[PDB]
């Protein structure tokens, strides 16, 4: 009989039951989407959108719901924090219930197609034996996909008959779902332009419509039909797996490096924003501009929004988690309550001392304070080592500007070294670890988890492309030579 | 050793399978609240 | 509110008997299909 790893090959030459099992897989996927959305809604806390966002609570499908227009709950709250009078059916709960109902309907359709497998549609008119005209099916489905792509780009994204897409500023402070007009110039091809998405979907939809018309009207060449095995479903499987892992690699790259389709308010900061100090430079720029206006240092740092300071924190770096460190980032480093303010360290000499930021590569990084000349002035010894630049010896004192601790100065060696250790992580933040019993070990943002999962999936699907392409091209000699 | 003459096949019809699944699920529903207390 | 033990009790208590019945039914159907 069939081995355990070939069982589903019974639906190979049965188009009806192939449609049935594909319907079952789609039903399972839609049911997972609905159940995951419901679970996330049961877990999600919309109390603090700025310091406890969705990407700090381990939300996975909620960012994808919010990226293309769903922003409200039937609970009278929104992701942006603006209370909504009448949410509307298409909230997160409504989307989840719609996906669950779709899963049930697809399950019923799969049952019907499995039971009613023998249809005249699936049998070739020339020879009764069942067959599928794969080129014509590809043309029809390509035309369908082109129509869907053009409709999404022209109506949903542009807001003519849709809600639009999620657009944020350069630093993720004010972002919301808005329509975008298409950009047909070269400026529509950089990944950080939301208008490029609309222009892309419209143009690609039109081209796909034309391509579907062609692949419907025109029969394949005999040379390509014999070379690619176009009468065999397995070559379609291999080519689809190839395109699928290609798209998986592309989406993994766009998620990890960042794009207009991966907003930082929905998926969190990227690691390269911490590597280049993307938010730190903006914060320092804003502080310098406020100082040049004449504002004092406390006023200048009191101008920095809490969200922007929270973005400049290494705990929000997706490259600081662990493979088996499970749960949300709040489970990792506690839930952020408030910004404590920017600390400034001065020695007995008065030189401004700066704690070097911890690179994502280092699980444990030494605490080093350097002046404007980069000279090492103070440090914390490893464990119990004799020290000549200890904080208790150099007499480093810290003063906080902005936040809760605005105007407060600390001298006690222990509190100064504690604040230095907290400041090597970027902007100082206060966390509570009792509501979730946090362990103090950094977790990963949903961006990093998506990148990991889909990169591994892309590699395994490259293996699948190799195997199934070998299967369809060397079919004749499969039982053996 | 050798061939054992007392070997008998075991059969469970679909009705019995469904009766068993229903009983197990109903007992789980009943006792889940008490196990979770 | 009880520990994963209460969860383990409910989930295993549900599954161990379920999979036993499913295995027995599949074995019976296998014998029926083999003899016919």
């Amino acid at each position: 009989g069939l081995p355990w790893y070939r069982v589903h090959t019974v639906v190979l030459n049965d188009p009806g039951r192939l449609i049935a099992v594909h319907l079952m897989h789609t039903a399972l996927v839609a049911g997972w989407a609905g159940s995951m959305a419901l679970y996330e809604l049961a877990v999600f806390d919309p109390s603090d959108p700025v310091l406890n966002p969705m990407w700090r609570q381990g939300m996975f499908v909620m960012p994808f719901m919010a990226r293309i227009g769903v922003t409200d709950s039937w609970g009278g709250w929104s992701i942006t924090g603006e209370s909504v009078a009448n949410p509307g059916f298409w909230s997160f709960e409504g989307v989840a219930l719609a996906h669950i109902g779709l899963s049930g309907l697809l399950f019923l359709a799969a049952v019907w197609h499995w039971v009613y497998w023998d249809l005249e549609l699936f049998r070739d008119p020339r020879t009764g034996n069942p067959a599928l005209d794969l080129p014509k099916i590809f043309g029809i489905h390509l035309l369908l996909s082109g129509v869907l792509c053009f409709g999404f780009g022209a109506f949903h994204v542009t807001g003519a008959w849709g809600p639009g897409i999620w657009v944020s500023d350069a630093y993720g402070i004010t972002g919301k779902v808005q329509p975008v007009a298409p950009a047909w110039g070269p400026e529509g091809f950089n990944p950080f332009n939301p208008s490029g998405v609309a222009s892309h979907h419209i143009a690609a939809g039109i081209l796909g419509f034309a391509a579907g018309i062609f692949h419907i009207a025109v029969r394949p060449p005999q040379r390509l039909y014999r070379a690619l095995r176009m009468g065999n479903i397995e070559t379609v499987l291999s080519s689809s797996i190839a395109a699928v892992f290609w798209s998986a690699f592309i989406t993994t790259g766009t998620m990890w490096y960042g794009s207009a389709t991966t907003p930082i308010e929905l998926f969190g900061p990227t690691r390269y924003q911490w590597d280049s100090g993307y938010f730190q430079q903006e914060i320092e720029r804003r502080v310098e501009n406020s100082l040049n206006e004449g504002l004092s240092l406390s006023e200048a740092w009191s101008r920095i929004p809490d969200k922007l300071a929270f973005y400049d924190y290494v705990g929000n770096n997706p490259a600081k988690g662990g493979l088996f460190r499970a749960g949300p980032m709040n489970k990792g480093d506690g839930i952020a309550e408030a910004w404590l303010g920017h600390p400034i360290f001065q020695d007995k000499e008065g030189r401004e001392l700066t704690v070097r930021r911890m690179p994502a590569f280092f699980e444990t990084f030494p605490v080093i304070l350097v002046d404007k000349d980069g000279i090492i002035r103070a440090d914390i010894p490893f464990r119990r080592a004799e020290s000549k630049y200890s904080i208790e010896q150099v007499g480093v004192t810290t003063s906080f500007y902005g936040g809760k601790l605005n105007g407060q100065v600390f001298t006690d060696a222990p509190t100064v070294k504690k604040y230095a250790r907290k400041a090597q992580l970027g902007e100082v933040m206060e966390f509570d670890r009792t509501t979730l019993e946090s362990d103090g070990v950094f977790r990963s943002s949903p961006r990093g988890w998506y990148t990991f999962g889909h990169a591994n999936f892309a590699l395994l699907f490259f293996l699948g492309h190799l195997w199934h392409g070998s299967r369809t091209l060397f079919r004749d000699v499969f039982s053996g030579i | 050793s050798g061939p054992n003459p007392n070997k008998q096949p075991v059969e469970l019809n679909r009705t019995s399978l469904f009766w068993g699944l229903l009983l197990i699920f109903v007992l789980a529903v009943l006792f889940s609240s008490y196990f979770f207390n | 509110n009880v520990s994963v033990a209460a969860y383990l009790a409910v989930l295993l208590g549900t599954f161990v008997p379920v999979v036993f019945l499913i295995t027995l039914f599949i074995q019976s159907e296998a014998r029926k299909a083999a003899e016919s």
């Binding site: - | 019809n13 229903l22 789980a28 889940s32 | 509110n1």
Partner: peptide, 30 residues
């Protein structure tokens, strides 16, 4: 979290009823 277990058990029981109704052994005269 126990609500997820309760809902799972109820949905499983309903599915068992559905499969018992629509996938029973068909009665035949012998």
């Amino acid at each position: 979290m126990e609500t997820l277990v309760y809902t799972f058990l109820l949905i499983g029981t309903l599915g068992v009823l559905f499969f018992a109704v629509f996938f029973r052994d068909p009665p035949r005269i012998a």
